[PDB]
Amino acid sequence: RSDGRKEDQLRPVSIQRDFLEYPEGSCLISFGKTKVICTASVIENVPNWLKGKGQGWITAEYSMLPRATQQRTIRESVQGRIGGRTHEIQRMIGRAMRTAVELTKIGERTIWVDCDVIQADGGARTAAITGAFVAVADAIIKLHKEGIIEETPIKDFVAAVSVGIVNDRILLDLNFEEDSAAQVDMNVVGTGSGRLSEVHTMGEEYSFTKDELIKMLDLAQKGINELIELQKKLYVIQDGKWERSELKEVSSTT
Amino acid sequence: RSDGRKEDQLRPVSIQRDFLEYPEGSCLISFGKTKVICTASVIENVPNWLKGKGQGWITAEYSMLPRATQQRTIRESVQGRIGGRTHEIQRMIGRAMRTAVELTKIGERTIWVDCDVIQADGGARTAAITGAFVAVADAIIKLHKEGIIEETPIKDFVAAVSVGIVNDRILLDLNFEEDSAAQVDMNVVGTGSGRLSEVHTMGEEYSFTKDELIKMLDLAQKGINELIELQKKLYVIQDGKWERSELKEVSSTT
Amino acid sequence: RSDGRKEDQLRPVSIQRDFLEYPEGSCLISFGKTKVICTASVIENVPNWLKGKGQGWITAEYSMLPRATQQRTIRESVQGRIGGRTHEIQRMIGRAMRTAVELTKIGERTIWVDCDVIQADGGARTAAITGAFVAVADAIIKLHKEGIIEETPIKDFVAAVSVGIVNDRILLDLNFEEDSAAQVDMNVVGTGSGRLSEVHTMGEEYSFTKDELIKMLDLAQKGINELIELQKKLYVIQDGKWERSELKEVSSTT
Amino acid sequence: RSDGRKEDQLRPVSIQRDFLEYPEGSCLISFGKTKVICTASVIENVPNWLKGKGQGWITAEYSMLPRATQQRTIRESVQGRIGGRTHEIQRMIGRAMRTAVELTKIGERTIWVDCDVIQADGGARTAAITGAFVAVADAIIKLHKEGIIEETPIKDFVAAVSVGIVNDRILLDLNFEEDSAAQVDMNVVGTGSGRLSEVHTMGEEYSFTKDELIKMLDLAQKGINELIELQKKLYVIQDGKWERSELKEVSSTT
Amino acid sequence: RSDGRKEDQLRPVSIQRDFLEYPEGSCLISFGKTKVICTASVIENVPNWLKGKGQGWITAEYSMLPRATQQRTIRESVQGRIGGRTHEIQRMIGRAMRTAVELTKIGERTIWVDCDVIQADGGARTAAITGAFVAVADAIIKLHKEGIIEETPIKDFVAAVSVGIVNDRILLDLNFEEDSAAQVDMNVVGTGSGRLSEVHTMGEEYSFTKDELIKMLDLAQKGINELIELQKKLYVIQDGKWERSELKEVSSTT
Amino acid sequence: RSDGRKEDQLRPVSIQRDFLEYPEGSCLISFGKTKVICTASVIENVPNWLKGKGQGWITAEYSMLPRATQQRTIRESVQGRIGGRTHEIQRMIGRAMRTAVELTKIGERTIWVDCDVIQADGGARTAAITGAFVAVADAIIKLHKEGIIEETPIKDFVAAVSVGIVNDRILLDLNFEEDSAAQVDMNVVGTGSGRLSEVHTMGEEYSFTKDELIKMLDLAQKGINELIELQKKLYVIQDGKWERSELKEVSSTT
């Protein structure tokens, strides 16, 4: 691989909590050169169709500053049209966060997750899901510490990683060049207990076999595990009670 | 199941070619009450970034008339904003068609695929991919018959189907009610030779196991096979030369 | 004329009711190659300015799939801007339906008419008005059959047709080529009892006389009559009580 | 009538040319309280589809300042959506101007007509067409005076007026109250030689007869004639050569 | 200067009140060739965040008809995107009007100010603020005359003017050519008692000194004074009670 | 002051260069809790109206992530309309950068400045201008180091600061609460040699005197000076040749 990395090897991973002061939860996560700021802010209100149903909600916003892969990613303001690809990803991130939280116990409020890619080199959305989780859990823990809610209703850790087939090679966590040159690529969202929340595999003008998929899904689940082992060092959990550990930052041994 | 259908059973399938006169290829496909008009029209031009590269292109447009699932699906004109969910699906359909065609041999022109859901009851996008293929192949065959191109550069059949877990039951081809009540749902795009082009599995606030995924992927591939056996009755193929058969319509035995 | 048609002759007309299962009323109408799907769906609600006034409402949506006149008609989603020409026509269709119905007796609900041109060769909006009526009446009859309303408050049949001057020839029901080459063209919306609901005549860089207008209006009213004679075979009416006849389809003798 | 006006009587009409200094042609026209500023500005360029075809073009922009009928008419900037009703009218005004001009002899340039309703009390679009003509002719005369073009290729005068049925009364030139209370209303665009360029009649939930239409069309043509007699005092024409007269303003005797 | 004007000299100024009949207040103001119609219309309602707080509100809309500086200024309707420069100015005009009025005493209603530049030659926004004031005061006086409100809660006159440095020359009230060629330009909004409401100075790729700014601010305040002396002839004020004078128009001696 | 800060005292300032790896220049600047990421990326191209004129260009994009002042600042994508306030600021930042650079010597390329407010507590736009300068200079220095251009055509340092009157107190660098409660507020953009590039003063329903303005402008220029003394520690300049110093970060003594 271009960076001397093994095929079943994640790039250097770094997760820094308390990145910003205002949000209830926030972090700066990095998978190699891909960097995303993830913030979780609490809005004391719920979407109109949820009022009264004794439940909270989580929703995400994703943005890719104009310097994606060292090119240009002009937003939606001073540009024009509103592409539905940002939306695909925000929906994904929203689904990952809600699966990890028992919204029943959050109260009628909303955790607004903001994922801001400040530098992209592939795997931006998977880095965003991995980081967003840290911000959401911290935010729920913060809400508890403030007496706003009774417990810390987090069900499990959630992380994500990309994987693909490049020159008939199965690689974990692809950078931007490995992914543009990929025949088949995939994104997997997994949980702490080894379960899956989401999986999308797309042949890029190539088709693949049930078996190649399983091989990719096995390499992804291992990546998800390593990423969750990292997240885990940020918390001290017992019988569903979550507290932050004293680590403000955790990185991979690489 | 609500309609007396088995768990590994597709709804009644119907594919009618030559549905409309103007498009080079067109059909009306139906998976139960879900109905989609799929047309393939040839534009003697290519997207700006493809000019000169001796290659054609395929792209799709998807629309869901305002009577989806017997509710309301107001378009993008007399409504306002432009959701990025229609775009997700058009991208999917585009990717499925391009994987099935050797664009190298199509010339510098574009096949414009239009998928119009005139009635929805779940599985609308998978019906659209299955139908769009028939329209694209017919369109390529038509182009050949007209001398516009040398061969019929179609690589293989492409079909799609949905599958999901409902009350811990794994069901093939979900209607709208089975899918709103699903814990996990999935869409699979497969090929004639049993390979896969795309797979998306989403936990709906539930997580699933690698094994449940495989079980779902096995039931999907069987559905894809039955759907492709149907498409196959519409063509007579030999050594990569495609001709339409005399069938104007094919349906499932149910 | 290009198709061997007389000057005071409509193209082959076909109206098929119960085209789709979900809408309260639906049909597929065709004036030659021009084909429009017309559906009438009931929304148990009214526009905000009508709440409380003991009255219902009817409104239309018009769309022209991207294969209009065998060219390209990219919608409003994956294209951009929202032209005000679709709106002109939806307003027209809305006005035609409301004139035909005693909204007082419909209750506080709205009949949402959807006109979808799946193939265009001129006269698309007039085919849409003619077809939309069939769907709206069927929908009102359906509502009655369900006990949702007391009577079938339909005042009269409504149909429409185009007419124009081409090479100083006055022609009824113009196809797409006859209309692009027209000096003057017109659209007329008439009723069962021979009255008029709307008339628009536009000189296309040519002016015309009061007399040429009357000649065109006379040829249109005859076309409207033939079209209404067709619609009439779809109903059995007595003292303002409407029932569908056993015909599921009616076509012209041509 | 509310203002003591006869039924076949236009409101007080006033047309003032040279209203503004920059445009090649400009005027302030008024039908009673309805006031419109009409400017014709020359752009030394043509729409992309007209390049090379040795012809000019005319196109219009219509806007209704936020004080229409003493209510609120918030534009398209600090409001949002872009209604297709402004577009209906701009298309109408464009069609009226082009019918009056031999574009062949204008050169490859465009006359950009701007109609700005600064006060509305019904008949705003007909006042705009009547006024726009004066601005376009003046602009063509100005172009000639400057040597930009050989002749003054204006074919004839163009004016417009509204008419309708209110309480079974046929009235000419309706104010805003007479038109909201109308059963049937109509707009007619006529020429100097008594011919017609456009006619639109709409039943407002009422239908009408061929004969009532003719009665309305006769009253309109008389209104068009009076309006054109006024425009005529602004020009001195001979064998197709147009010059402005010394009148800077012309009004009706009322 | 191009027009023989001194450096500390305003162009010919003209303010005409009662320009239109419907608005509670209206005028046509002109600074040389720059012409703006300013109307103040009362809406018996307040913005949602102001309901109940016993206060009124003032807000502005600004538009520049397509003939700005004898070029093209296509609006926001039949053009597309919505630039945030019109908004800058509307915000400015809104701020100037609200500073001049004791909203506490206006009641819960809104004065909707419309500024329409019908001809531009520089200084359009400053002419608009100067004119808008006249329309707002007249509108408040009108409201009083009608008994809608107790007093005429106007705090002071408000006017505005531009100034800049051109070829190291400090000029007051710049036309369009003097401003495109300016190294530094500025807009100042002042009050009757010599105070300031707003000031914006922008170096156009040139920087300036605190002292050059003061020199410009001194020349502006003198321009503001002359403009307010003109406005003053339109009113008769005593102990905060405002009445219009008998002047319908006031112009500068030039 | 709420934070124990003097009246002529800036909050703690921190500027960190090389914040990100991809952009030619980048930094994270902070004025207290207000934090902005500023990146300068080079596009080997120019705006269409500049082609051929032997000159480069600089333009800015500004965005305020949804957690502004601990509230909600939903962007322009998954929200809708495009406010013209972001545009006001991007124009300001663009003007500040271009004034500081001799575009003549940059070549025909564009420096694309991206300012991303990741946390806001007042003074976000002034922090963005101060930070953007550092990124642009670094980017120009980087371009030189790469041989893309001959020199480092930077004319001078550019910084900005806010100032206002709160309870008749003149304060430098306002936080969000001091600014919402301000009677008058101002933003000043200054240069290294003590000159000014821009100044905007707005009375917030209060007017002010020429003298209060000067007092505010004096306090601002002192703030600009302190900010520029900080920027200066990041460079080593001689006869117009710029090199970065070894500092990767500089902060204020507070």
Swiss-Prot record, chains A, B, C, D, E, F:
HAMAP family: RNase_PH. GO terms for molecular function: 3'-5'-RNA exonuclease activity; RNA binding; tRNA binding; tRNA nucleotidyltransferase activity. Its EC number is 2.7.7.56. It catalyses: tRNA(n+1) + phosphate = tRNA(n) + a ribonucleoside 5'-diphosphate. It holds the Pfam family RNase_PH. One of its GO terms (biological process) is tRNA processing. Belongs to the RNase PH family. It is an enzyme of class 2 (transferase). SUPFAM superfamilies: Ribonuclease PH domain 2-like, Ribosomal protein S5 domain 2-like. NCBIfam families: RNasePH. It comes from Aquifex aeolicus (strain VF5). Phosphate binds at residues 85, 123-125. Disulfide bonds: none annotated. Keywords: Nucleotidyltransferase, RNA-binding, rRNA processing, Transferase, tRNA processing, tRNA-binding. Phosphorolytic 3'-5' exoribonuclease that plays an important role in tRNA 3'-end maturation. Removes nucleotide residues following the 3'-CCA terminus of tRNAs; can also add nucleotides to the ends of RNA molecules by using nucleoside diphosphates as substrates, but this may not be physiologically important. Probably plays a role in initiation of 16S rRNA degradation (leading to ribosome degradation) during starvation. Homohexameric ring arranged as a trimer of dimers. Coiled coil: none annotated. This is Ribonuclease PH. It comes from the Bacteria.
